[PDB]
Design an enzyme around this catalytic site. Sequence first.
Site, PDB file in Angstrom:
ATOM      1  N   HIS A  63       0.800  -1.224   0.000  1.00 15.18           N
ATOM      2  CA  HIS A  63       0.000   0.000   0.000  1.00 15.18           C
ATOM      3  C   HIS A  63       0.842   1.289   0.000  1.00 15.18           C
ATOM      4  CE1 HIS A  63      -4.194  -1.658   1.116  1.00 15.18           C
ATOM      5  NE2 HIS A  63      -3.506  -2.554   0.430  1.00 15.18           N
ATOM      6  N   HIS A  64       2.037   1.224   0.614  1.00 15.16           N
ATOM      7  CA  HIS A  64       2.748   2.434   1.019  1.00 15.16           C
ATOM      8  C   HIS A  64       4.243   2.061   1.145  1.00 15.16           C
ATOM      9  CE1 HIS A  64       2.987   5.845   4.255  1.00 15.16           C
ATOM     10  NE2 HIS A  64       3.046   6.375   3.043  1.00 15.16           N
ATOM     11  N   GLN A 126      10.948   1.558   4.393  1.00 16.63           N
ATOM     12  CA  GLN A 126       9.761   0.991   5.043  1.00 16.63           C
ATOM     13  C   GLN A 126       8.763   0.549   3.958  1.00 16.63           C
ATOM     14  OE1 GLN A 126       7.354   3.206   7.616  1.00 16.63           O
ATOM     15  NE2 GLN A 126       8.971   3.932   8.947  1.00 16.63           N
ATOM     16  N   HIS A 128       4.839  -1.043   3.669  1.00 16.49           N
ATOM     17  CA  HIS A 128       3.599  -1.283   4.432  1.00 16.49           C
ATOM     18  C   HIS A 128       2.773  -2.218   3.612  1.00 16.49           C
ATOM     19  CE1 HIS A 128      -0.682   0.129   5.831  1.00 16.49           C
ATOM     20  NE2 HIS A 128      -0.307  -0.939   6.513  1.00 16.49           N
ATOM     21  N   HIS A 198       0.913  13.856   8.846  1.00 20.65           N
ATOM     22  CA  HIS A 198       0.911  12.624   9.651  1.00 20.65           C
ATOM     23  C   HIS A 198       0.294  12.882  11.011  1.00 20.65           C
ATOM     24  CE1 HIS A 198       1.971   8.578  11.045  1.00 20.65           C
ATOM     25  NE2 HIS A 198       2.458   9.151  12.134  1.00 20.65           N
ATOM     26  N   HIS A 200      -2.269  10.246  13.964  1.00 24.44           N
ATOM     27  CA  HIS A 200      -2.898   8.948  14.170  1.00 24.44           C
ATOM     28  C   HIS A 200      -4.442   9.092  13.947  1.00 24.44           C
ATOM     29  CE1 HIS A 200       0.995   7.297  15.060  1.00 24.44           C
ATOM     30  NE2 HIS A 200       1.161   8.029  16.148  1.00 24.44           N
ATOM     31  N   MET A 270      -0.175  12.383  17.314  1.00 22.95           N
ATOM     32  CA  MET A 270       0.885  13.199  16.749  1.00 22.95           C
ATOM     33  C   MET A 270       0.270  14.198  15.764  1.00 22.95           C
ATOM     34  SD  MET A 270       3.555  10.294  15.530  1.00 22.95           S
ATOM     35  CE  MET A 270       4.790   9.644  16.667  1.00 22.95           C
TER      36      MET A 270
END
Length: 312
Positions: A63-64, A126, A128, A198, A200, A270
Site C-alpha cells: 500500500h505504502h 519501510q 507497508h 501525519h 494517528h 501526533m
Amino acid sequence: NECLGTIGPVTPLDASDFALDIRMPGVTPKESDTYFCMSMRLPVDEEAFVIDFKPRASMDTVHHMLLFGCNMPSSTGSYWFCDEGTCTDKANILYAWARNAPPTRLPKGVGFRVGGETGSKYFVLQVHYGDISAFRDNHKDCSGVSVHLTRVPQPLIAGMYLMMSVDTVIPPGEKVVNADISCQYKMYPMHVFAYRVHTHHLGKVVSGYRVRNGQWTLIGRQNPQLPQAFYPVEHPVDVTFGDILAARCVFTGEGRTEATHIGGTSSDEMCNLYIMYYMEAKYALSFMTCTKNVAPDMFRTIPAEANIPIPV
C-alpha cells in the site's frame, strides 16, 4: 536475489552516476497491516545527490513505501518490524509512495544531498503491507525502490522542514481541538514543492501556510487519514527570511475515554507536517524543524479554509 533478480545492489550508469536497488530480502507478512524495514548503506563515502526514484511495488499487498536517510538504522538485521523504530538517530524522509497517490517526481536540477560530511550514510526503506489474502503464508516479496544517485553537484538541494506539535492535549469528547505550530524562518530562501501530513486516528485535517507581513499563503492541506504520500504543491511557495511557517492540525476527542496528548513521548497522537523544499545549493541545508508555537495570537486571523473538513 531472494526473488531471482539479477540486478546487483549497485549499478553504474555512466561516468558519475549509479543506481541503488533497495528491495526487501524476501519477506512474508503473516498479518494484515504489517510494516517491514530494511537498511541500505551508501556505497560511497564522499557526497552524492539523490536525483530520481523508481518504485518496485508488488501488484496487490503493498500500500505504502517510505524511504529515509539516516546514520544509524534501528537494526543491523536483513530486515525488521518498523514498530521497533526506523532509525535510532533522526530519520530524514526522502520519498513516499502510496498506491494511487499523485507522484512527486523531483523537479529538474534538484537532488537530496547524502554522504560526505553532513549527509546521511544509510537509506532505510519501510514497506507497508495492507490486508493480505489467506494462503500466502510462504510467499516471498522483494518490494522496494530503485534510487538514482549522481556525484555531479546539483544546483538546487532538496530538504525537509518538519513541523511538529508537542504542547497540546485533546480532552475526552471535545468535538474539535486545534494544535497550532509556528516558527520564524531565518535562513536563505526555500521553495516548498511537496508536503505530507501525519497524525494517528483522531486527525481530521492538517494545513501549512507561509505568513508574510500578515498575509497567509497555503502550502498545503490534507486529511491525514488518506495515504500519507507527498502531495505536490501546484505552484511552489517561496519561504524567505522573516516569514513565519504556520500549521494547524484539527483533531477530534469524540469517542475517547481519556485525555490524548499530541506529540507525547509515548505518543497516542501526533501532528507532523513534512514540507519538502529546495534551496540554492551553496546556501542549502538538508533539514530544518519547528516544534513550537511562537506566534499563537496570529491563529485568530487564520484563513477560514484551514478549518474546513476534507472528508473521508
